[PDB]
Design a protein around this ligand. Structure first.
Ligand code: ATP
Ligand code: MG
Lengths: 63, 30, 372, 328
């Protein structure tokens, strides 16, 4: 629900909150609203460099 | 009426150890 | 030999002959039982790689000897200087005898073996007993298949029950023939005679029995993960798709290739539910599968479901609580093909020394018959 | 140093004592034995008894015997008594497909991991000349994918698809002699759960497990791109590191402090474990793709004399290439 403030806009880089940001980003793609998709896609590339390709697995096996 | 074998009893073989050895096979396989 | 360590046991079949010594857990030699003449005599393995340029003949059918001029030439190849190298004068033999064989044939093989070969010991054994001797049991039910017909035979302690033996007239030959008919409806023409052994490799490599037909058809209609490519000796590549799980189902539904009956699953039920009430539980727990035509994937896991459903709507109608107390179990070790041989590898080992198991040569010098 | 045997994948590979012969399985129902005649690999023997996909091989060096297991629910023990290898039969009593096999340090038992929620420990009997099995099945809920043995020939590590890594005891009283006391525990009956791990919330399938030379440390890799080391000397404690790379498919100890791993990134890596309980990444070891292997690495083994003194290690995988890597 704070993803709107994120839409209006790496930060902490705790090496464990990157997984939480990845989870929020991939859960936000299910409900596009004509402007959130572009900014979320733009931050996906930024977060990928800081976190890594491994982080995509953590959200994929989060269950 | 008839025995379990469903046949006349064979008197020749009645008139006239595998089971000991087969127990180890029965134990090992099952 | 003097101490008795030259006993040889051989299983004779319509498709394959399996010969070896006692005390070994493996066959010494396997070879197909083909004898043929060109269009002098090519017998044994040589009649397999080349058969388009050769006229073949099968000298047996469910134990019945078709011609008594070709089995001698096959047995010379078995007991000859290319496979076993035996000195025939000093040996004893253990043979198989399929269920429900006529008397004349039983005493013709015994008669011809003592005369033209001069062995020193002969015994003939029922295959149902031998299959369970290799499993450690004594009372059970054998469901044997192959290239002849599928027999279901019970057996009590040591002695079979010929009254309660049932047979079904479909085997590997009918399934590999039906696969030719199915493959004919894709643009692939295989003639009946010269390409029989080319489609058999396709059957052996890519065929399986489905557990639930519904998911099989769903994957066959909406997905392409069942189609596989097979290479041929000519160099062509053919594609086999949904035909994998249609050919093996002549066993469970016999009317698809014009055979009147009930199928293997229901025939097993009709055989177990025909004996005295006390011994019926003794047969439910111990059912053994034998033969090469029961190595399809899933055939173990389908008969259990069919028997459980056939026993929950015919005997115990409704009331689904007591099936847990009703224990049913099917035994099928990954050594199903040679269980006739392995049993013969045990019975010749235990009774190697005492000289009453064998039929002595001197018995036929005076009497000419046997009572054992 | 790369060598390409065949274009097909290599399911599994086994070495012998002198590192002269190699046993391979090129994704079929056969096993090929190769030797080295000078400076070129030429095939030597073929072993063919299975009728299904072969999934695991191992080579007992001191006894010089090859155990083979596959997806046809079979296992065979191959021995060389004449010029031609011959098999011996193993009774396993499983109804699903086997997945892994491994010899013991003393070469008297071997452990088979299968998909029927079982672990089969098999030992030899000579009155009728075959191998007979015992089953461990109590706490397992899914298929086992990895196995390892302790130096003291009793304990047994296992990883399974139910997101757990377990340590059992496999003491067979007919064959083995009484063991000593370990930090892992004291009371060791057959089939008794000695320890269990796997609590991390987002756990994935464990693909590889391994013990250290001292025997008091365990290491395992998971499908959530994590490696973990469990210590039992000071206390039963864990330390898990969350790597930022693809999943890892094998693990092996090089020493008490360093552990080498490999996986789908096609490049082996080295991790360090401090005595205080911390895992830290060190470096890769391989500084078309910019990597010698062209596909995922499936197996990592030691070319040298194992964990007492390890210098070189061997990698093989789906690309069909086998590579020897030297630290120096
Ligand atoms: N894995 C397999 N899958 C399917 N079919 C197989 C498989 N292995 C063998 N077969 C088939 O099983 C048959 C082999 O029969 P088998 O060797 O058991 O003969 P047999 O018992 O001596 O014969 P019979 O009793 O009819 O004289 C052949 O049709 C062969 O194609
Ligand atoms: Mg037969």
């Amino acid at each position: 629900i704070v993803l709107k403030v994120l839409i209006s806009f790496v930060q902490s880089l705790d090496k464990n909150g990157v997984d939480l940001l990845m989870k929020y980003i991939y859960k936000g793609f299910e409900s596009p609203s004509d402007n959130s998709s572009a900014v979320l896609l733009q931050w996906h590339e930024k977060a990928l460099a800081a976190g890594g390709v491994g982080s995509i697995v953590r959200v994929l096996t989060a269950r | 009426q008839l025995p379990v074998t469903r046949t006349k009893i064979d008197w020749n073989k009645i008139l006239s150890a595998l089971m000991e050895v087969m127990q180890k096979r029965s134990k090992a396989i099952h | 030999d003097s101490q008795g360590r030259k006993v040889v046991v051989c299983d004779n079949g319509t498709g394959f002959v399996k010969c070896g010594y006692a005390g070994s857990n493996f066959p010494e030699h396997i070879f197909p039982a083909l004898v043929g003449r060109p269009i002098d005599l090519m017998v044994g393995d040589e009649a397999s790689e080349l058969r388009s340029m050769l006229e073949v003949n099968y000298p047996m059918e469910n134990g019945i000897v078709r011609n008594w001029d070709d089995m001698k030439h096959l047995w010379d190849y078995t007991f000859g200087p290319e496979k076993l190298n035996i000195d025939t004068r000093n040996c004893k033999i253990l043979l198989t005898e399929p269920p429900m064989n006529p008397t004349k044939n039983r005493e013709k093989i015994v008669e011809v073996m003592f005369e033209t070969y001069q062995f020193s010991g002969v015994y003939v054994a029922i295959q149902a007993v031998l299959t369970l001797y290799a499993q450690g049991l004594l009372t059970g039910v054998v469901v044997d298949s192959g290239d002849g017909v599928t027999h279901i035979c019970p057996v009590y302690e040591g002695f079979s029950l010929p009254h309660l033996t049932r047979r079904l007239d479909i085997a590997g030959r009918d399934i590999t023939r039906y696969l030719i008919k199915l493959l004919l409806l894709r643009g692939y023409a295989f003639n009946h005679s010269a390409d029989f052994e080319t489609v058999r490799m396709i059957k052996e490599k890519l065929c399986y029995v489905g557990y639930n037909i519904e998911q099989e058809q769903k994957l066959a209609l909406e997905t392409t993960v069942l189609v596989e490519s097979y290479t041929l000796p000519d160099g062509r590549i053919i594609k086999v798709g949904g035909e994998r799980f249609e050919a093996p189902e002549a066993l469970f539904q016999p009317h698809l290739i014009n055979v009147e009956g009930v199928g293997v699953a229901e025939l097993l039920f009709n055989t177990i539910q025909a004996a005295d009430i006390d011994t019926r539980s003794e047969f439910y727990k111990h059912i053994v599968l034998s033969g090469g035509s029961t190595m399809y994937p899933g055939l173990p896991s389908r008969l259990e479901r069919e028997l459980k459903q056939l026993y929950l709507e015919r005997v115990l109608k409704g009331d689904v609580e007591k099936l847990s107390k009703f224990k049913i179990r099917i035994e099928d070790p990954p050594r199903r093909k040679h269980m006739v041989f392995l049993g013969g590898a045990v019975l010749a080992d235990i009774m190697k020394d005492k000289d009453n198991f064998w039929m002595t040569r001197q018995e036929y010098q005076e009497k000419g018959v046997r009572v054992l | 140093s790369l060598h390409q045997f065949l274009l097909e994948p290599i399911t599994c590979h086994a070495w012998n004592r002198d590192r002269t012969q190699i046993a391979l399985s090129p994704n079929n129902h056969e096993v090929h034995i190769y030797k080295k005649n000078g400076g070129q690999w030429v095939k030597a023997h073929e072993l063919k008894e299975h009728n299904g996909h072969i999934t695991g091989i191992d080579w007992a060096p001191k006894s010089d015997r090859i155990v083979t297991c596959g997806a046809d629910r079979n296992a065979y023990v191959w021995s060389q008594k004449d010029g031609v290898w011959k098999p011996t039969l193993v009774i396993l009593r499983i109804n699903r497909a086997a997945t892994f096999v491994k010899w013991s340090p003393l070469e008297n038992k071997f452990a088979v991991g299968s998909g029927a929620r079982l672990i089969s420990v098999c030992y030899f009997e000579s009155e009728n000349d075959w191998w007979v099995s015992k089953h461990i099945k109590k706490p397992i809920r899914s298929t086992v994918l990895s196995l390892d043995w302790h130096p003291n020939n009793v304990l047994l590590a296992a990883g399974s698809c139910d997101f757990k890594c377990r340590v059992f005891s496999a003491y067979i009283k007919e064959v083995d002699e009484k063991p000593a006391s370990t930090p892992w525990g004291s009371k060791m009956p057959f089939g008794q759960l000695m320890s269990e791990f796997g609590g991390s919330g987002t756990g994935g399938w464990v693909h590889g497990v391994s013990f250290s030379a001292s025997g008091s440390r365990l290491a395992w890799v998971s499908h959530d791109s994590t490696v973990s080391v469990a210590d039992a000397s000071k206390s039963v404690q864990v330390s898990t590191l969350k790597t930022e790379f693809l999943p890892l498919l094998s693990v092996s100890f090089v020493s008490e402090n360093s552990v080498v791993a490999a996986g789908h990134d096609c490049c082996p890596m080295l991790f360090n474990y401090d005595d205080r309980g911390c895992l830290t990444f060190v470096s890769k070891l391989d500084i078309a793709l910019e990597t010698l292997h062209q596909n995922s690495i499936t197996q990592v083994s030691i070319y040298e004399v194992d964990k007492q003194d390890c210098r070189k290690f061997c990698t093989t995988g789906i690309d069909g290439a086998m590579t020897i890597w030297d630290f120096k």
